[PDB]
Design a binder for this molecule. Sequence first.
Ligand code: HEM
Ligand code: CTE
Ligand code: CYN
Length: 347
Amino acid sequence: ISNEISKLDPLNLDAFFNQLPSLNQNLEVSLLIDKLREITKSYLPTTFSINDALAATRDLGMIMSSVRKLGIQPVSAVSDLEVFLETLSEITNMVPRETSYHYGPWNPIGERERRFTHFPDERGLIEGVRIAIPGIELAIREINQLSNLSLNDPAFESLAKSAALHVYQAVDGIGETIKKTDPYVFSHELRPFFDPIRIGGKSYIGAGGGQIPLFVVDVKLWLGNHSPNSEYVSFIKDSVFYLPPELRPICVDSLLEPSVINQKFAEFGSVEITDQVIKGMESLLSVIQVLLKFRKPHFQLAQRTLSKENRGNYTTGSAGYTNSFNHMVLEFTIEVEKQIRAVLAPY
Ligand code: HEM
Ligand SMILES: N[C@@H](Cc1c[nH]c2c(Cl)cccc12)C(=O)O
Ligand SMILES: [C-]#N
């Protein structure tokens, strides 16, 4: 529950986070490092509830990212963090780092909102994932119910429509980023806050909107187990254990099964094609077409951001890919649309 985590301040950092944008602007690394040290001596994380540990991962993660932004590995500089992070990670059963979950839906709205910088463009990122994630999560549950209904059942069409509506929340979220986040300001002022951090011998990437569980919708809906050695499966493979635990079984099951659309392609070309069946297959095109309404403007925005004019120090996103990856996911998604349009063409 997002609001039950967003309202917590387990490490009493509310005042500190009002100062953090200024601390970051003036490069006050000592104050950052003093705060990490104060936390490891002030708090016994083992006594935390789950929601407390999730909110503490949010707050501690963002301070660690500010230190890493300067170029210092924060756990190397504050070595007692490692034990602290290990204890939090056992309670959350999540990585010892913040993700888009902690930064968006679990990040409080209004005066307490945790932010790296004073730049209003940063709001574009936060609101983007804060809007996308709950809607994608609702679409995931509806799309998983589709495998067991008939294309001729009107409940199928109704569920698929409900999920297209819920996926639109991701469209609205990337639209908010496009309005609020200048590509140049992103590459020069925000991107450096999302770099990898070394914790207990492993490197954990920084938060990314690619951590919204849209890839989980893909796997269930069209990717399934049909593209084993693809670059997209390798990114999903790398993402499964960044997800909150409750989404991991859905994703793993889906990676090892035929997708909904491959199955409904088989059923369609094998059953009495009625008027409901065509409506049912048309509701899947509708979901796919909402994904395109997300991925097309998204591709454009990553292209402007990584252009020679607007990029700064980076040629890649926080997960380490170029816009070539985005293009590859978009082509995949366009191919699905073309395939469904063929199955429907004689109707
Ligand atoms: C200035 C803003 C943004 C830029 C420059 C950007 C760029 C990128 C890049 C470079 C990747 C490749 C993965 C990586 O290397 O990190 C990626 C993938 C992805 N990004 Fe963004 N992005 C931005 C905003 C957003 C927002 C606000 C969201 C969600 C609300 C989002 C959702 C995704 C998703 C879901 C993927 C996985 C690929 C896909 O599903 O098509 N991005 N993006
Ligand atoms: N990964 C992308 C943009 C990005 C980084 N962090 C984000 C967050 Cl926390 C939300 C939305 C987008 C982004 C890039 O590094 O170019
Ligand atoms: C993309 N974040």
